[PDB]
Amino acid sequence: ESWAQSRDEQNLLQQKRIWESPLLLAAKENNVQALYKLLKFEGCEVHQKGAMGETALHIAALYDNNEAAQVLMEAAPELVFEPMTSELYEGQTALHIAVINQNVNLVRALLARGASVSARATGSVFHYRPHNLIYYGEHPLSFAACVGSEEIVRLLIEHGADIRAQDSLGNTVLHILILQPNKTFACQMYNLLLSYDGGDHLKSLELVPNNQGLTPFKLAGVEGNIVMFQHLMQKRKHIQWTYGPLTSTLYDLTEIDSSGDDQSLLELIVTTKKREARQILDQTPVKELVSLKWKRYGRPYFCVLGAIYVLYIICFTMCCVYRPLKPRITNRTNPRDNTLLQQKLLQEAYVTPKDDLRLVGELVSIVGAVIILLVEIPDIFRQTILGGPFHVIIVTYAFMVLVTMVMRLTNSDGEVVPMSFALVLGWCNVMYFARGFQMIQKMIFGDLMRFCWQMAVVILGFASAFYIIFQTEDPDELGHFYDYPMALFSTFELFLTIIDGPANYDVDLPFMYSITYAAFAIIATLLMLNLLIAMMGDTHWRVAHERDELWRAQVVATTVMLERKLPRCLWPRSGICGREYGLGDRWFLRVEDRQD
Amino acid sequence: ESWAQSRDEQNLLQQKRIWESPLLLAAKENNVQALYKLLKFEGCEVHQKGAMGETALHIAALYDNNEAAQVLMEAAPELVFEPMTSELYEGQTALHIAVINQNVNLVRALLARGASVSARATGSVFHYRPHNLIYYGEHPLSFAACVGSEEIVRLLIEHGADIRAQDSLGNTVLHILILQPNKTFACQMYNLLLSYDGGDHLKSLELVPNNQGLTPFKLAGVEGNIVMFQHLMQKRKHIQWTYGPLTSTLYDLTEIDSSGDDQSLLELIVTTKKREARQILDQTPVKELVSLKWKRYGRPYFCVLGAIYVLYIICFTMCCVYRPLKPRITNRTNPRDNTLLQQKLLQEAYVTPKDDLRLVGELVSIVGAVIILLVEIPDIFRQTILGGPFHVIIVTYAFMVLVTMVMRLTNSDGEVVPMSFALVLGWCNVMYFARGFQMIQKMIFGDLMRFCWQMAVVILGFASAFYIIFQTEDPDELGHFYDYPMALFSTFELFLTIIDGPANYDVDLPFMYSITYAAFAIIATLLMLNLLIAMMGDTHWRVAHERDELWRAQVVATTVMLERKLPRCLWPRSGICGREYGLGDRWFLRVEDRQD
Ligand SMILES: C[C@@H]1NC(=O)N[C@@H]1CCCCCC(=O)O
Ligand SMILES: C[C@@H]1NC(=O)N[C@@H]1CCCCCC(=O)O
Ligand SMILES: [Ba+2]
Ligand SMILES: [Ba+2]
Ligand SMILES: [Ba+2]
Ligand SMILES: [Ba+2]
C-alpha cells in the first residue's frame, strides 16, 4: 500500500537477488574460494548491481566480510566509488556501510583505495522521517560521529573530512549529535569534532545555524536534551570569583533571549508541541532568567492589565444590566400563548435622562474591543496554547461586541443572541488572569483559591447572562432572574445544583436559555472536577510537581506574552550589558550558587 | 464428601498399612537388617500390595531408600515391573518415583534391571486437575524433563525413551514443559529434548499438535508464557542484515495468523478467559502485527462501519420522532382520570402526503436489522467479551425492530414498549464505536473524550425514548418532553440531576417511564463513576497502563472482529508472501529494531 510495505518487499527482493547472484551470495557468505573461482576464471559481471543497486562490495560491506571485500577491491578497485544506484539508498557508498559497522580495518583499506569522504547518501532510508529508526546524516564523517567511534572520526578528518559539511536539511555534524538517544556519550564526541575547527572566532562551527535557523546550542533546547544543554552551557559561562561555597558565575545569555523576535530560546519552548522541551527552562542558566522577569515587571503588569480587563468587563455588563427599553407594545401576547416575550428594541436611543452614562459606557466597550483587535489581529499573521485559550476567547469576545453594534443600527429582534455571548466570553476569560501566583499542603489551599476565583468568575458571567435572558421575559413564570441581586443568587445556587432547572415548560422560554444553561452545566462540573483532581493530585504522589510544573510553564508562556506588545520604555531588558563595562556587547546574567 | 477428603483418608490409610506391614515398614525406614530377616528366613509375601496397591519397592522408592530398594530387587527382581494397582496411581511404576526424586543411582539400577520407559501413569493423582499440585504427564521421560534433571532425561533417551510419546491429553514432552512454573529454567530442558528429534523436516516434534489442536509454539501464547514464547520465537525468525544499531529481522508469522480460521494465535488470546495470555500480543513479533492491522484497514473500516451505523440509528429515530398518529378518539379520558393517554395507533398507514419519506425510512430499518442478523446469527453457531458487549446488544436491537414489525400489522396497543427499547440499544451500542483511538496527561484528556462521546450517545438514546414515552401523554402535566428540542434539553439536564424527577403523581404516567428512567439513572451514574476512575486512575500510579492495556486488547479484539466477516478483496493479508520471491510459501513480517 504505502511504501513501508514496499521496502519490506525490496529487502526480501534483495535477499532474493543475493540468493540468486552467486557473486553477491559469496560476498554475503564470505566465500573466498568461491570469489576467486568466479572472478579469475569463469568470467563474471563484477559491476553486478543487485536488487538495491548495490555492488558485490556493498554486500561484502553490509555483512562484515573483510576477507571477501579485500578480494573484490584487488580484482576490481573501481567498485569503491560506485554508490547505490537504487532510490532507497541513492548516494550511499561502500564507505558509509564500513563506517557505521565501525570496521576500522575496512575503513583503513577503503581510505587507502581513495574513498570519497564527502559522498552524500541522499537515499530515502537515510531521511529524517519517523519511519526511519536512525537519522545519521549523509556524510561518512557524520556516521562515524553518531556511532560513537572516535577512531573513525579522526581517521576521516585525517583524510579531509569537512566538519563544516551540511546535509540536505542544513544540519552540521554538531546538530546531528544532539538528535541522538545516547545523550551522555554524545557529549564526548561533540568535543572531538570541535577540536578540528578552524580555531578562528569568525565562521565558527557552533555558530553555523540550521536550515530552520537553529544553532546547535539553540537546537538542544527545543529538543529537550538536558545533557547536551548543560554541556553546551559550560562554553558560555564565566566564573567571576569563588568565595568559599559561593560561585558567582556569569552566564552568556545571548542566544537565550529576544530579538531575533522569533529567534529566541524562550519563544521556541513555549510554542512547540514538544513536551520534553519544557524541561529546558528549568536549567540553572534559564530558571534564574524567567524568575526575575516574573517577580518584577511580570507579575505587576499582569495584575495592572488584569484589573484593567476586570473593569473593562464589568462596564460591559453595567450597560447590559440596564439594557434598552420597550414594553411589548404588540398584541402578539394573546396568540401563541406559550410565548412570554416582552421584547425591548426601543431604538430611540437618545433619551438623555441618565443614558448618557450608559452611552459613554457603550462607547468604552467599542473602543476597547477594537484595541483588543488592534493587538491580536496583527499578531495572528505572525498559535499554541499553554498560556491558556485566552487569545482564542479574547478575539471572539471583541467579535460579539462588534456584532452587537451591527445588531444595533438595524433594530434586529435577536439583540440578545450576540450580546449574551460576550458576557461569558468576557468573564470566563478573566479566570485566565488567575495566574498571579508566586509543599503538599499550602498547595491544596493554593489550588482551592484557583477554584474560588474561577467559580466566582463563571457565575458573574452566567448570572448576568441569565438575567438578560429573562429580563425581557415574564418573571411571574420562571422568575429565577427578575432582578440582578436575585439573578446572581439564583445562578450561584444553580452552580451547586441545589436549585432545580429554571425550565417551566407550560410556557415557552427563549432560544438562548436552552443554550446558555447547557454550557453552564458543563463548566460548573468541569470546575468541580478540576477541583477534585487538585485536592487529590496534590497528596497522592509527587505528581503535584506534574500539576505544578505546567502552571509554571503557563506563567512562563504568559511572561513571554507580556513582553511582545509592551513598549521599550517599560519592562527593561534582563541582565546587564557589556559595553562599558568591558565585556560588551552581549547581556550577561550574574548568578551565584551555594554547594553543600 | 468429595474425594479430596477421600485421598486424605487413603494417605492416612497408607501410613496405617506401612505401620502394620513390617515389610513395607522396613522399606520405608530403610531397615536393611530387618529386610534380610524378613526375606530370607521367616517366609514372607514379597508381592505385598499395600494400601495404595504399592509394592515394598514402591515404598522403598518413595522415600529415597537405595540400600532398601537394592535388597528388594536382588531377592525379587519381579517387583520392578509391578505398577500401582490402586486407582489413584494406576500405571505408576517404581521408575516413575525414582525419576521424580532424581535418584540417579536408583534410575541407573532400575534401567539396569530393565524398567519400562513407556509405562503410562494414568492414576487420578497424575491428572491435569486443579486439585493436583503438579502435572508432569505419564511417561517417565516426561517426569525427568519436568524436574529439570537433564542427566535422567538423556539417561532415559539412551534406553529408548520415545520423545514422540503423548499422554492421555495428547501432550508431548514439549507441551508439558510449557505448563511448568519455572519458565526460565524449562527453556534449557526444552532444547535438550529437541536435540534427540529425528532430524527430518517432516514429522517434527515441534509440529505434533495437542489433542485440542495446539502446537507447543501455539500453546505458549494461550498460556501467557512470556519466557517460552520469546525462546520459541528464536527458532522462527531470520535476521536479514545488521546495519550498525539496526537489526532488520524477518519473523515467520505462520502459526500467528488466520485460516485455521479457528486456528490462530490472535483468536485464541482475545477469546480466552486467561488474563495472562493478554501479554503475548505485546511481544516483539506480535506487537508489530496488530499495530499495522489497526493503522491501515483497521481504523478506517471501523469508522466507515461506524458512520454507517450512526446513520442507521438516527434514521430509526427519524421514523420515531414523527411516529404514527391518533387522537385518543375514545371517551375513556373521563373514567380513570389519572390516565393521560392520547393513544395513537392509527393503522391507516397509507396517507401519502409525506409519509412515503418515513415509509422508505421504515423499510431501511427493516433491511438493516436482518442484515445485522445475517452477520451475527450465523456467527453464534461457531462467545467472549473484551470487544465490549456490542454483539450482545446488536442482536437484541435487531430483535426489538422485528418485534415492532410484529407489533405492527396487528394494531397492538403496546406499540411503545418494544419500540422504545430499540432506541437505547441502538445508540448506547454506538458508544462501543468510541474505540477509534490511535503519558499521564493527554491520557486525562483522552479518557475525558471517552465520556463526552458516551454521554452524548446516551442522552440521544433516552431523550428520544422519553419523547416517545410522553409524546402520546398530555404535555400540560409532566411536559418535560413535549417536542424534540426540549426533550433533548430536559434529558440532558436530567443527566446531571439538575432537574427534578419527571414524575408528577397526581397523574398516572405510562408503564415505560417507570422503567426507562430507572435505567437512565444507573447509566448516568456509572458513566460519571467511570469518569472519576479515568481522571484519578491516570495519575495516582502507572495503573494507567493497566487502564491502558485492555483498551488496547479491546482494539485488538475488535481488529480480529473486523477481519472475520469482511471479504478478501478488501483488507489485504498482513506480511509479504514467500513464493517468488524465494522463501515461499509462508508470509513473513519484516521488522527492524534499534538498540542503545
Ligand atoms: C540492510 C540494507 N542492505 C544494504 O545493502 N543497505 C541496507 C542498510 C540498512 C540501513 C537502514 C537504515 C535506515 O533505517 O534508514
Ligand atoms: C506420596 C504417595 N505415596 C506413594 O507411594 N505415591 C504417592 C506419591 C504422591 C505424589 C502426588 C502427586 C500429585 O499430587 O498428583
Ligand atoms: Ba396555562
Ligand atoms: Ba442534586
Ligand atoms: Ba431538585
Ligand atoms: Ba386533580
Side-chain angles (χ1 to χ4, degrees), chain B residues 7 11 14 59 62 84 89 92 97 125-126 132-134:
Chain B
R7 57 209 298 213
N11 287 271
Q14 187 181 24
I59 296 303
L62 177 63
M84 310 273 290
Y89 307 89
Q92 185 194 37
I97 318 177
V125 296
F126 311 105
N132 289 331
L133 301 170
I134 57 172

Short mmCIF file of all heavy atoms in Angstrom, two decimals, chain B residues 7 11 14 59 62 84 89 92 97 125-126 132-134, ligand 2:
data_model
loop_
_atom_site.label_atom_id
_atom_site.label_comp_id
_atom_site.label_asym_id
_atom_site.label_seq_id
_atom_site.Cartn_x
_atom_site.Cartn_y
_atom_site.Cartn_z
N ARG B 7 -8.84 -39.10 49.49
CA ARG B 7 -7.45 -39.45 49.44
C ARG B 7 -6.78 -39.08 50.76
O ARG B 7 -6.02 -39.90 51.28
CB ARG B 7 -6.76 -38.59 48.33
CG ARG B 7 -6.86 -37.06 48.49
CD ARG B 7 -6.84 -36.23 47.19
NE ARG B 7 -5.61 -36.45 46.54
CZ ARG B 7 -5.01 -35.55 45.85
NH1 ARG B 7 -5.49 -34.30 45.69
NH2 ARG B 7 -3.93 -35.94 45.31
N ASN B 11 -4.14 -41.63 52.13
CA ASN B 11 -2.77 -41.34 52.55
C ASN B 11 -2.57 -41.70 54.02
O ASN B 11 -1.52 -42.21 54.40
CB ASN B 11 -2.44 -39.87 52.30
CG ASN B 11 -2.26 -39.56 50.83
OD1 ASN B 11 -1.15 -39.67 50.30
ND2 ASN B 11 -3.34 -39.18 50.17
N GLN B 14 -2.66 -45.37 54.00
CA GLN B 14 -1.38 -45.88 53.54
C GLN B 14 -0.40 -46.02 54.70
O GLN B 14 0.15 -47.11 54.93
CB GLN B 14 -0.80 -44.97 52.45
CG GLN B 14 0.45 -45.52 51.79
CD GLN B 14 1.01 -44.58 50.73
OE1 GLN B 14 0.76 -43.38 50.76
NE2 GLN B 14 1.76 -45.14 49.78
N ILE B 59 7.33 -48.36 48.09
CA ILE B 59 7.59 -47.63 49.33
C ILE B 59 9.07 -47.30 49.45
O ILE B 59 9.45 -46.19 49.85
CB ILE B 59 7.08 -48.42 50.54
CG1 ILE B 59 5.56 -48.58 50.45
CG2 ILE B 59 7.47 -47.74 51.84
CD1 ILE B 59 4.83 -47.26 50.36
N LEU B 62 9.57 -44.33 47.13
CA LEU B 62 9.01 -43.05 47.61
C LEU B 62 9.87 -42.26 48.63
O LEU B 62 10.06 -41.05 48.49
CB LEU B 62 7.61 -43.27 48.18
CG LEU B 62 6.92 -42.04 48.79
CD1 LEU B 62 6.70 -40.97 47.73
CD2 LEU B 62 5.61 -42.43 49.45
N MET B 84 1.43 -49.61 40.34
CA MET B 84 0.47 -49.40 41.42
C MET B 84 -0.90 -49.89 40.98
O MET B 84 -1.49 -49.36 40.04
CB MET B 84 0.42 -47.92 41.78
CG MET B 84 1.77 -47.27 42.02
SD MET B 84 2.33 -47.45 43.72
CE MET B 84 1.19 -46.35 44.56
N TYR B 89 -3.13 -44.21 41.64
CA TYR B 89 -1.83 -44.27 40.99
C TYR B 89 -1.75 -45.34 39.90
O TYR B 89 -0.66 -45.86 39.62
CB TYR B 89 -0.76 -44.52 42.05
CG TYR B 89 -0.78 -43.55 43.20
CD1 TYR B 89 -1.57 -43.78 44.32
CD2 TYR B 89 -0.01 -42.39 43.17
CE1 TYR B 89 -1.59 -42.89 45.38
CE2 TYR B 89 -0.02 -41.50 44.23
CZ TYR B 89 -0.81 -41.76 45.32
OH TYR B 89 -0.83 -40.87 46.37
N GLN B 92 1.52 -46.15 37.59
CA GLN B 92 2.81 -45.69 38.09
C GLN B 92 3.66 -46.88 38.51
O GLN B 92 3.20 -47.78 39.21
CB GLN B 92 2.62 -44.75 39.27
CG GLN B 92 3.92 -44.14 39.78
CD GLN B 92 3.77 -43.48 41.13
OE1 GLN B 92 3.03 -43.98 41.99
NE2 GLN B 92 4.46 -42.37 41.33
N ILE B 97 8.71 -43.03 40.40
CA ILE B 97 9.06 -42.41 41.67
C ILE B 97 10.56 -42.12 41.73
O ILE B 97 10.98 -41.11 42.32
CB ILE B 97 8.61 -43.31 42.84
CG1 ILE B 97 7.22 -43.88 42.56
CG2 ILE B 97 8.60 -42.52 44.13
CD1 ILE B 97 6.73 -44.83 43.63
N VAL B 125 -4.21 -39.11 40.45
CA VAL B 125 -3.39 -38.06 41.05
C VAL B 125 -2.60 -37.37 39.94
O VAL B 125 -2.47 -36.14 39.95
CB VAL B 125 -2.58 -38.61 42.24
CG1 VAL B 125 -3.51 -39.06 43.35
CG2 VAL B 125 -1.66 -39.74 41.80
N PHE B 126 -2.09 -38.12 38.97
CA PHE B 126 -1.36 -37.56 37.84
C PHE B 126 -2.15 -36.78 36.80
O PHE B 126 -1.58 -36.37 35.79
CB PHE B 126 -0.58 -38.68 37.16
CG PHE B 126 0.21 -39.54 38.12
CD1 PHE B 126 -0.21 -40.81 38.44
CD2 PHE B 126 1.39 -39.06 38.68
CE1 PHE B 126 0.51 -41.60 39.32
CE2 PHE B 126 2.11 -39.84 39.55
CZ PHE B 126 1.68 -41.11 39.87
N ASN B 132 -4.73 -31.15 41.76
CA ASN B 132 -3.41 -31.77 41.72
C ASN B 132 -2.37 -30.66 41.58
O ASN B 132 -2.43 -29.86 40.64
CB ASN B 132 -3.30 -32.76 40.56
CG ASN B 132 -4.10 -34.02 40.80
OD1 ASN B 132 -4.32 -34.43 41.94
ND2 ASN B 132 -4.56 -34.65 39.72
N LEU B 133 -1.43 -30.61 42.52
CA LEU B 133 -0.48 -29.50 42.57
C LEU B 133 0.54 -29.54 41.45
O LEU B 133 1.12 -28.50 41.12
CB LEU B 133 0.24 -29.49 43.92
CG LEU B 133 -0.66 -29.37 45.15
CD1 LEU B 133 0.14 -29.61 46.41
CD2 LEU B 133 -1.33 -28.01 45.19
N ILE B 134 0.79 -30.70 40.85
CA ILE B 134 1.74 -30.84 39.75
C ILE B 134 1.11 -31.67 38.65
O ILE B 134 0.34 -32.60 38.91
CB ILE B 134 3.07 -31.47 40.21
CG1 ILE B 134 2.83 -32.84 40.84
CG2 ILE B 134 3.81 -30.55 41.17
CD1 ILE B 134 4.10 -33.61 41.15
C1 LIG C 2 3.04 -39.97 48.43
C2 LIG C 2 2.27 -41.11 47.76
N1 LIG C 2 2.79 -42.35 48.25
C3 LIG C 2 3.15 -43.17 47.10
O1 LIG C 2 3.62 -44.27 47.15
N2 LIG C 2 2.85 -42.41 45.89
C4 LIG C 2 2.32 -41.15 46.26
C5 LIG C 2 3.13 -40.03 45.59
C6 LIG C 2 2.43 -38.71 45.78
C7 LIG C 2 2.55 -37.89 44.51
C8 LIG C 2 1.34 -36.94 44.41
C9 LIG C 2 1.44 -36.12 43.13
C10 LIG C 2 0.10 -35.44 42.86
O2 LIG C 2 -0.30 -34.54 43.60
O3 LIG C 2 -0.58 -35.78 41.90
#
